[PDB]
Amino acid sequence: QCVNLTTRTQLPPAYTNSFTRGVYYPDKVFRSSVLH
Amino acid sequence: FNCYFPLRSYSFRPTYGVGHQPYRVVVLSFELLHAPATVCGPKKSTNLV
């Protein structure tokens, strides 16, 4: 079931600052009080 | 011409050459992760101390 939606509001994509997000745990190894 | 179809059909026959006989190739990729393992061998388990 495919329905075409033509009620879009056309606008160029906006941009913002990522700041310091997106950081995740690189591995499943526990570490504590270290700089890795 | 100028456009050949990649698909080709094998002609394996019981009286083909030694190298021409079909061979079943099964490859298993072994991967070790820091996550707990779920595929272990037949070795038993003892009591902790």
Swiss-Prot record, chain B:
Effect in UniProt of substituting F1P: In strain: Omicron/XBB.1.5, Omicron/EG.5.1
Effect of H34P: Increased resistance to human covalescent sera neutralization
Stretches the record annotates as Disordered: 34-49
Primary role: Attaches the virion to the cell membrane by interacting with host receptor, initiating the infection. The major receptor is host ACE2. When S2/S2' has been cleaved, binding to the receptor triggers direct fusion at the cell membrane. When S2/S2' has not been cleaved, binding to the receptor results in internalization of the virus by endocytosis using host TFRC and GRM2 and leading to fusion of the virion membrane with the host endosomal membrane. Alternatively, may use NRP1/NRP2 and integrin as entry receptors.
Subunit structure: Binds to host ACE2. RBD also interacts with the N-linked glycan on 'Asn-90' of ACE2. Cleavage of S generates a polybasic C-terminal sequence on S1 that binds to host Neuropilin-1 (NRP1) and Neuropilin-2 (NRP2) receptors. Interacts with host integrin alpha-5/beta-1 (ITGA5:ITGB1) and with ACE2 in complex with integrin alpha-5/beta-1 (ITGA5:ITGB1). May interact via cytoplasmic c-terminus with M protein. May interact (via N-terminus) with host bilirubin and biliverdin, thereby preventing antibody binding to the SARS-CoV-2 spike NTD via an allosteric mechanism.
Protein name per the record: Spike protein S1
